[PDB]
Design a protein around this motif. Structure first.
Motif, mmCIF file in Angstrom:
data_model
loop_
_atom_site.group_PDB
_atom_site.id
_atom_site.type_symbol
_atom_site.label_atom_id
_atom_site.label_comp_id
_atom_site.label_asym_id
_atom_site.label_seq_id
_atom_site.Cartn_x
_atom_site.Cartn_y
_atom_site.Cartn_z
ATOM 1 N N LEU A 175 31.817 59.503 79.760
ATOM 2 C CA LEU A 175 31.541 58.544 80.710
ATOM 3 C C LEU A 175 30.385 58.757 81.812
ATOM 4 O O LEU A 175 30.302 57.874 82.445
ATOM 5 N N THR A 176 29.790 59.902 81.556
ATOM 6 C CA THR A 176 28.579 60.196 82.367
ATOM 7 C C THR A 176 27.520 59.114 82.197
ATOM 8 O O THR A 176 26.638 58.985 83.013
ATOM 9 N N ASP A 230 31.139 51.876 89.970
ATOM 10 C CA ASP A 230 30.935 51.737 88.445
ATOM 11 C C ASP A 230 31.465 52.947 87.692
ATOM 12 O O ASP A 230 31.987 52.480 86.583
ATOM 13 N N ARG A 231 31.531 53.989 88.265
ATOM 14 C CA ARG A 231 32.004 55.162 87.618
ATOM 15 C C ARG A 231 33.684 54.941 87.397
ATOM 16 O O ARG A 231 34.256 55.143 86.513
ATOM 17 N N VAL A 281 27.966 51.230 94.892
ATOM 18 C CA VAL A 281 28.210 50.454 93.520
ATOM 19 C C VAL A 281 28.160 51.471 92.273
ATOM 20 O O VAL A 281 28.805 51.197 91.167
ATOM 21 N N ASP A 282 27.698 52.711 92.570
ATOM 22 C CA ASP A 282 27.713 53.637 91.496
ATOM 23 C C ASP A 282 29.017 54.334 91.537
ATOM 24 O O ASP A 282 29.525 54.532 90.268
ATOM 25 N N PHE A 316 35.055 51.960 87.410
ATOM 26 C CA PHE A 316 35.038 50.973 86.280
ATOM 27 C C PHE A 316 35.159 51.373 84.961
ATOM 28 O O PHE A 316 35.690 50.999 84.026
ATOM 29 N N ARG A 317 34.219 52.364 84.673
ATOM 30 C CA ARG A 317 34.052 52.950 83.276
ATOM 31 C C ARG A 317 35.397 53.676 83.189
ATOM 32 O O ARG A 317 35.951 53.529 81.823
#
Lengths: 148, 144, 145, 149, 149, 149
Positions: free
Chosen positions: E127-128, E85-86, E81-82, E88-89
């Motif tokens: 984006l971090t 998520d990165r 998920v992380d 996706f960002r």
DNA sequence: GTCGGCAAATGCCGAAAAGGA
DNA sequence: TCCTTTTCGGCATTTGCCGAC
């Protein structure tokens, strides 16, 4: 809540009598009545109701057996929720009848007189089921409509 | 003007008041509770009858009531703070309005919303024959 | 004509519409959502924002908006059934009304109650100054929270 | 942009709540916030937050697994950038909700209750992705602005 | 949807760019996007993106280390998920910059070069965090509106 | 009577639901219902009701303890008058709620949710007293008659 | 980890004939 | 006739260990 159908002062008289019969404040909420039933009523109050002639000994026995009542008194326990429920049914119908007829005597006589609609049973015997209690209330209201 | 009712029945008989009480009446009088807006009536029903929108009854009907502007309405006395928690007072006032049969309508304030007025409708008043009622159906674009 | 709003602010700026969008508008335009009845606005807020009465914000305020009779209204096109599930269409129509700046008010139907009409208010129309606003307080005899 | 939407005292209250919840100065710039997140928050702060009843154990586990958290604290380690960003998401959503709702209980309650907009998921459960966090932000701003139609 | 709906007709272009970057339909709802992120993106898509020239190996390893990427592609598990998520960002700001500038080349040049606002950091590094992502989005919005100084 | 206010249509609905729930013919009189309650009810019917998901096991316990019901079924004894009366109160409130709400699911949900009028008690918990059952009936009839103010 | 069930001996309920007015 | 007094038989169900979801 058929007691509210009583006209003019009826319900108020119903609450006064109910206060004298079972120590229920006149302005208490219906939820407070439910709470008083669930917490259990004092058995000493039931014994006093029998002594003052409010209930007949057979009526008290139908509310609670005598050995059980003496056990409640010695062990200093309030009545169970169903014993208290039957006591409340009795006191509620008694107060409703006293408000309809205007006197304890006629009311107690009408409550102890068998009825054709109940196959020869008395209204006090009809207080074993929710449906029978509702039927007694309906009959009292029918009487109060066409006063008699 | 226009009034709105939310109830299982599509009439203005209000016979349930003969055996059921409310905030503004004691059991034994025929009466109809109405609002000035469908959202008003819906909010009153949802809040005071504690119905979740997922449990809204499928027998419930929204009734639009039209009356002429000549109808009679009785003024409610001024209410001091605390009346929303004094049901005896409001029931007494409504009973007095209903039994006096002086007017057809009684405007009363809402207990959940300010500047909101609901209405008591007495069907035993002779002006209750001029009411025109129609059901407004809940459409799929009008869900809860 | 009296309109009713429920929001955390006691003005008609609508600047939050420049960042967040609604059912009747896309972000980048200022707009005020209002109802014709305080219970209408309350029901809309509670249902669409999923707020329980015990969590009703203290910041929330109820605003009465009085407008003159000469105020200008727009007309929404005939909607086909199913629009309550087509946010793109509603946003398109609201954006059109707000960008044309042809009128101050836009009557829209409600997605909750039949025969109920909510309103869009364009704070960039020259008639927005003619609005008189006032806060209606929530007294314990007029509260659900 | 956020400070433009949060009017009156919304942004000031949000920054004060962030200062209380994450030791983030109210006058710090957004770039200062980003740098603070990249530098890493202390695990002691996280355990204090979950002890004071700010985060629930399941929310703390969403932020970081329990074994990893114990490793970090017993190794005198700050949290990683992703763990710090998750905690910042939690604290940001909490502070924003407390600014919009005006008090703590209402905000946390509304954040802890299922929503049909999220198919029966709580806003705190939406804080696993950038998209869910932005959805929660959008809902909070719709509440603040009165976009309830 | 927080700060990407502020452009005239640019939102649909952004959604189309995102559909090109990740398999995310133009008409998919935001909750659907959240569930797509939480379901886990395939690492094959990530290696295909870093091959097609939209993600540099360093921008790829910022999302997921190379060892972990090999582990994912071998043992056949989608990104966590992380990691998702990165990713996706990354794809989100890429689609946003493509909708702003109108072409992929200038967008990639702008995203890959450092910017002063960020004290010598490239927007892809911002984006971090949630905050840096929001800052990149605000910068793109300022560029799109034609803001001066 | 109950039928007078309950609108012969809805009253027939209530009697049909009560027949399905308690095998009381929809044309029996009120005295017949009283007699059926006094004659006793079969524990078989209660276990069938709890197996068909009509009554929650805690509701069954509120009607009668489990060990006592096992004694009843072993001895092939009908339920006592008070146990039968609790059962009738349960089924009768269920039938009235289904007659008012129009659907069994909504009715059961409304009966299983706490009420502020009952100080955080569900209507099913109100069925321990005559007055509580009466309050539940009053609320249902208020819903049916539109006494919402 | 929650909700639900099973069964033994502590504990409760009150039957029943015998006694009292 | 009507009602009470107590006997222990006998009903009732807690209470903790042990299953299902």
């Amino acid at each position: 809540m058929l007691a509210e159908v009583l006209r003019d002062n009826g319900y108020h008289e119903y609450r006064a009598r109910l206060q004298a019969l079972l120590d229920i404040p006149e302005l208490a909420s219906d939820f407070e009545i439910h709470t008083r039933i669930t917490d259990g009523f004092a058995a000493t109050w039931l014994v006093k109701l029998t002594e003052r002639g409010v209930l007949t000994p057979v009526e008290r026995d139908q509310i609670i057996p005598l050995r059980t009542l003496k056990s409640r008194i010695e062990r200093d326990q309030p009545l169970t929720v169903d014993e208290s429920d039957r006591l409340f049914r009795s006191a509620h119908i008694t107060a409703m009848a006293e408000a309809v007829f205007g006197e304890a005597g006629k009311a107690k006589r009408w409550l102890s007189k068998p009825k054709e609609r109940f196959s020869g049973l008395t209204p006090m015997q009809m207080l074993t089921t929710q449906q029978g209690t509702t039927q007694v209330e309906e009959m009292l209201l029918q009487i109060a409509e066409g006063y008699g | 003007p226009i009034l709105w009712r939310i109830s299982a029945y599509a009439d203005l008989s209000g016979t349930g008041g003969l055996r059921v009480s409310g905030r503004w009446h004691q059991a034994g009088r025929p009466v109809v509770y109405a609002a000035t807006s469908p959202p008003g009536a819906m909010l009153e029903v949802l809040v005071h009858l504690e119905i979740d929108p997922e449990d809204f009854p499928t027998t419930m009907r929204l009734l639009r009531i039209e009356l002429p502007d000549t109808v009679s309405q009785a003024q409610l006395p001024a209410l001091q703070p605390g009346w929303s928690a004094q049901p005896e007072l409001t029931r007494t006032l409504g009973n007095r309005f209903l039994d006096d049969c002086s007017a057809l309508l009684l405007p009363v304030p809402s207990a959940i919303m300010p500047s909101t007025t609901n209405y008591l409708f007495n069907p035993r008043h002779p002006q209750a024959q001029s009411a025109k009622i129609q059901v407004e159906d809940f459409t799929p674009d009008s869900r809860l």
